[PDB]
């Protein structure tokens, strides 16, 4: 009654990317642990190395591939589970959005198990097609498709569109049980030295675990107050809870410790991914699901506690690597007129007074700005260093945002924005991404247009009246 479909990631050119997990599940079903008839396990192959192919298209082609091989079985009423890796995750989420956003109860997918999904993007996607194809994790010279890489770029418009659309989902309430499994171990033998993201703390060498999590909040900040005063009003929303687990000592790819690539028949019984793939596949109820959620999070705590400090030693060097728990902000800033702000300055603030110079030492990990939509900003931060120094008596747990959009207020300004200030701290969570959309009031001065019945001609002064228009 159960069908299983594997979906790989980008820059994949061989179906052994799935390791030996497919054979395992078929072999496990033969022993009564799964109800998968012979021939109901499918290996998915899709073309991710084409510059002309967008993400939507592959989601359209996935639909065509599903109806093609198993329309008869879906008519009988079987439903399938999705075990994806890397881009496969976002692809299937798009396919669901393209075909079942508002009738998920009638979607033929029964389970969706995502392995290290770049649900909120990969920092390396901005590196390009050629500079990143050189990294042996892809290899060829110029590997993955440009349009796939536009999607995965941090602060991507399409990424925001699909994830804000997914804010409304309720998979559990509709009989769809989704999960996310990821690791935070760097396969240090493949660290590209002149591309630090490959050994970034908080990642498996490719995707940051905070980008894997499907538990995230959208925070909308609207500027108000006429010419003073009131200013910012906040409204926050959150996805439905999803089973989230950071498993121990598993990187993104590679036979050695690849989250899926490292699965063999011999080690499947003790492979964290193999073990938990199955337990998720076994879910058939709401209580079973929620018991798996509270089990997975417990593991997440354990692995991130056990992988906090690492001492690797060669005959040449001695090194300690610190891996904490992290967070991610995707900032979008628009205005009340439809323009997308691209020129601005954004500050995190803290202290009794919400000063931009007060955040604890070491709060920052990385700042990236999207190439196509420049006005999108993705910050990568150390939640543990922050929360540690944030939550004290004389800092009071404060954290805020200050956007200085441009052009700024001046004695000659005619269309400009004002300083926006927000004071809070719950915005950030460990191993979580946050989407902050900040809407500013575009302020046009009355001088931009004036009328006077003084019919004696005169020069048109660019003299601002210092008074805004309604």
């Amino acid at each position: 009654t159960m069908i299983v479909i594997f979906v790989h990631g980008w820059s994949v050119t061989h179906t052994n990317t799935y390791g030996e997990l497919p054979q395992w599940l078929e072999n496990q079903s033969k022993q009564g642990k799964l109800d998968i008839q012979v021939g109901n396990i499918y290996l998915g192959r899709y073309i991710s190395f084409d510059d002309t192919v967008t993400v939507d298209d592959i989601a359209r082609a996935f639909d065509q591939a599903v109806r093609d091989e198993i329309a008869d079985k879906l008519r009988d009423g079987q439903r399938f589970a999705c075990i994806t890796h890397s881009t496969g995750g976002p692809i299937v989420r798009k396919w669901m959005d393209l075909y079942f956003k508002n009738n998920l109860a009638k979607c033929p997918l029964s389970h969706l198990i995502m392995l290290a999904p770049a649900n909120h993007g990969s920092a390396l996607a901005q590196l390009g097609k050629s500079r990143l194809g050189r990294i042996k994790s892809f290899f060829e010279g110029i590997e993955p498709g440009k349009c796939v890489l536009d999607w995965l770029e941090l602060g991507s418009d399409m990424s925001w569109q699909l994830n804000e659309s997914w804010l409304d989902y309720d998979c559990t309430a509709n009989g769809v049980y989704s999960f996310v499994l990821t690791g935070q171990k760097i396969d240090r033998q493949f660290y590209d030295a002149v591309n630090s993201y490959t050994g970034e703390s908080g990642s498996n060498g490719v995707v940051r675990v905070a980008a894997t999590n499907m538990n995230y909040s959208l925070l909308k900040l609207h500027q108000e107050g006429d010419n003073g005063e009131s200013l910012v009003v906040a409204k926050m929303t959150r996805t439905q809870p999803m089973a989230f687990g950071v498993l121990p000592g598993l990187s993104h790819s590679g036979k050695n410790i690849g989250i899926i690539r490292s699965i063999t028949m011999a080690n499947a019984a003790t492979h964290p991914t193999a073990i938990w793939i199955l337990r998720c596949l076994q879910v058939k109820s709401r209580d079973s699901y929620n018991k798996l959620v509270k089990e997975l999070d417990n593991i997440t705590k354990e692995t991130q506690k056990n992988e906090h400090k690492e001492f690797v030693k060669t005959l040449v060097f001695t090194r300690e690597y610190i891996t904490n728990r992290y967070s991610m902000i995707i900032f979008r800033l628009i205005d009340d007129r439809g323009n997308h702000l691209i020129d601005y300055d954004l500050y995190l603030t803290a202290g009794p007074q919400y000063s931009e110079q007060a955040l604890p030492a070491g709060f920052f990990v990385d700042r990236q700005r999207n190439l196509n939509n420049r006005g999108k900003l993705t910050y990568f931060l150390d939640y543990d260093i922050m929360e540690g120094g944030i939550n004290t008596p004389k800092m009071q747990g404060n954290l805020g945002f200050r956007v200085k959009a441009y052009p700024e207020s001046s004695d000659q300004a005619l269309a400009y924005y004002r300083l926006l200030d927000f004071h809070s701290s719950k915005i950030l969570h460990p191993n979580e991404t946050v989407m902050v959309e900040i809407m500013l009031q575009r302020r046009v001065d009355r001088t931009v247009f004036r009328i006077s019945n003084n019919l004696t001609p005169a020069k048109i002064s660019g003299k601002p009246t210092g008074k805004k228009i309604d």
Copy 2:
């Protein structure tokens, strides 16, 4: 329930209200003699900022609303309505202001008349030349360089002018007690022909804006591909509006500026002053109809007399041929929502429409928009087109052929197929622009995603099936 207000609106790079010539002084006196009902002090000079890089057209239209309320909110509340006499970009400004504030209830927009002097309603070919290069041109000597965002508005094939004009397809000013008129000229002030820029003397233009781009009588043909490839044509058209081409008038200049060259002494004989007075005297649909025919007659008289111009000097003899012209603005997208940038576009003619059968001399110019490279503005010679195509061996045919890439090939995976629209005398009209939005069928090959239950790992072939997906 009685009285008339008049508000003048100038054009771009205007820094002095003498841009309006002496037309305000004239109308005040004409109303004093009983030819209009305009109380003393109800004629207004508008002055807005067009030389600011930060100020948008939306900004100015919004600022116009505040300027109106700021000065004549009381009178409007008394049941008074104003007539906007606009010049150049002032027209696009006022149209945008009706769209922002009163589209779906024009019946009580405070505007009763809109007389539009030489407005780049469908853009100005000069805009793409740039800010610095244009400020140095003889058409811009009288002011400062133009705003970057204003220039983004008047660029041929611009998105904003497209958005505004498609919205104006649904307008109906006449039925709502709003009488709009467009008046322009087609004479080149040859003393201001920029040498290294032919647009400043382009036939069918007044040195700045093309006659066809001033007309508000335009169509929108949406051509959708279906499929053996098929095409479905659907066209709509604006409501009839008064349109006049007056004799021997340029865009600006004290010599023959359509409004700039109006003095107290020459107003009685000035074509602009005469017909502006007539237009303001309309208070009925029948009066509107009568003016429509009378104005069209002036267009045919004007374009008959100005067909040839003989310039002789002690140094050279020259003949200038100004005919009647047509304009297209092509938009090209696909059925998945993407906006296409790479395509080849053909006009067709003959028995079954060869791209090489067009009459010699059909072409005047084409321009590709800088921000949307998929927007194509063609400028053609309707006389020569119609003259050759409406013959027995030509059978009065015309069509479009679009070749968008990636094209069909063994490289397929993702591509488009040719479109052939087969039509016409109608698509073209003299002194008229037409918007041709063509929706393509994006085809995806099935190997873009396939699933197979053969658990034996294998390489992933990028070879298309030759069969598209749904």
Copy 3:
């Protein structure tokens, strides 16, 4: 006692680009009309469709291929003749410049016959790699190397550099006999409706007649000086054989200048005819008589091809092809900078009015990598006809103004230059026009004062200039 090597053009993937001319030169030699041993005819094949391969690469490679195959025969005192087509011409010209610039008496090349070389560039190159590859004749969809396009875009730095070096050449005096043979016929099937250059008058569909000629002048105008102003300096290459053959396009089996040559039509093919004559030249006299005969063929061809009437059951059209002139402008200043923002004017008439003949202009192009290189394409006949009249006194000049202009605030600017002359233009010829502007800096850019009381720094110009 002679070797022949064929060199092809860009986007060529098959040796048949040379038509059947190679077998024709082997048979003509066997009949006693040339002294070529059997096996001394060579087909050169170089890669032009690789984005990473440069013209410098291909030249360096030509030398290695020559040495790899005929080092034996070259030391035995044989020397070879190169018959080039399209970009193959510039390639040999570059090789020539890499290994035998200072001593053409020791170069193994004895003859160079160039078939429609875009020696001064091709207007098509700017169209891009993708757009050009879609032209059915060369069809593929993205084809030629981008570095090849960089060399062959009008006004490119490299072709400019190679050809400035060529004002110092004199192949004939060094025993080397050079030739340019081209046509001006449009193969009208290959006309691309979205790219009008494909039928441009004054071209063979790809190369303009004035772009293949090696008879050009490099005119240098140095603005000196409140006033005083212009100084002119013109240098010109040594004479070369230039022939415009009848009824031949760039490529295609129908009327390709070399591609349409067959075993059966070679005797009447204008190319095969004059290729044999060019190879038979062996002295100053043979070269000079050949030169003038090509001049007669050029005037005969261009007089018969002035008007062409094409006929179809759907339309009847008339094609007028005149003789055209190309100017290539280079604009720098007395400091080494390359000027990008400026307006350029042709001026004519008694007062040299930039506003003064109708139809003078055909095309203008701005190079994509060097923004300051401006290429004119002009109708010489219409030009000469309108200016060499009583009321226009045959005058022709330039005017340039680089930005910043002299302004109320300008501190680093340029002064208008005005050249008066006319010989700059000749039909079927390109002229390279380098203009050195005088960069003027106002003193306010730097002042010193012993008034030690601090004060704000005003940037208002003093109205004076620094040395």
Copy 4:
């Protein structure tokens, strides 16, 4: 029969001559007390335009010569020479001036002393930050946005910076009676730190210029790829110049600006006033060489006292570590004249020269020039590196590895070969010196395969194969 003349020239962003603090009046009164021989009226305040986009550094140098000739022509004719005291970009400008008029006859240059305070001789990391972002920085609150041509010059690894400073390799200021000096500081004025641009508080700088960029004791390093892969290296170095890292001084600001904070009430105890007065008194090869010995001593003590700073407010406690750093400026060309832009560069250390063996914390910052993509400037911590490399297990080794593209592959036709260079932190002939910039020019051997051109006398037409021969052409 003369006295000396002194001319101040400021840096970029300067709209007011108070940028020089009160140093000029101090030098006037100090001369009045017999400590200098400056006649009244022989001290000049220079003002050049740094905020105009149309104005290049070459135009500033040109204008300086005209200004000097406009004001003190007959003074210089009568046998007088002037001392230059510069701050920020004024340093390079004068250096550009000397190069335009006296490159190879410094014995005939009217300048007798050059005292540069915070010259971005090798550029400022802030220059890459466009002239719009940079005018928003609170430091130059009083100043307006730069001219773009000054930025292009100040940008790290700019071609024009490489040219002037490469021409300065053959200078010998001391041997021609010209006494030049570099006196900088490394204090961060923590009050004006722009939190959106961390360079403004970068360790190893004063807020604008890194200590490695000020110094004129630098080396040019050439690595020529040879073989039929072997490397041949040629190192060249400038003549010793006075170098001083003075204590507790930032770039600008009346609080602790190296020159902006100078008043007459604090001049007697201002390190910059003390040492400038000493430089101006140099009148021999002897006094000069012993003045640089003194500056080396102060440079040392300054960086030992400023290694650790602790700022304590009621809200937070912080500790800032500042060590000694070195700047590598990479230029990459090939033997054909082309400029290699696409490549990757690995510093390698330890036995067997592994890229993955560099000492932890070796790196501070990397920047790729905007106008010339082939220029790579690395900013490195010398102490952490020298500490980790000059140990038994590391054998004191440091090398370079550049790959260059296209690389060796089945593509081939025109490609490049791996360059492996080995040497350094030995203290005998090392490549990195503390508080120093090093210039590294990398020439790769462009390799073309024989398939790019073949000839054959088999006259039967055939398809042309782009299949690489795997063998190269000379």
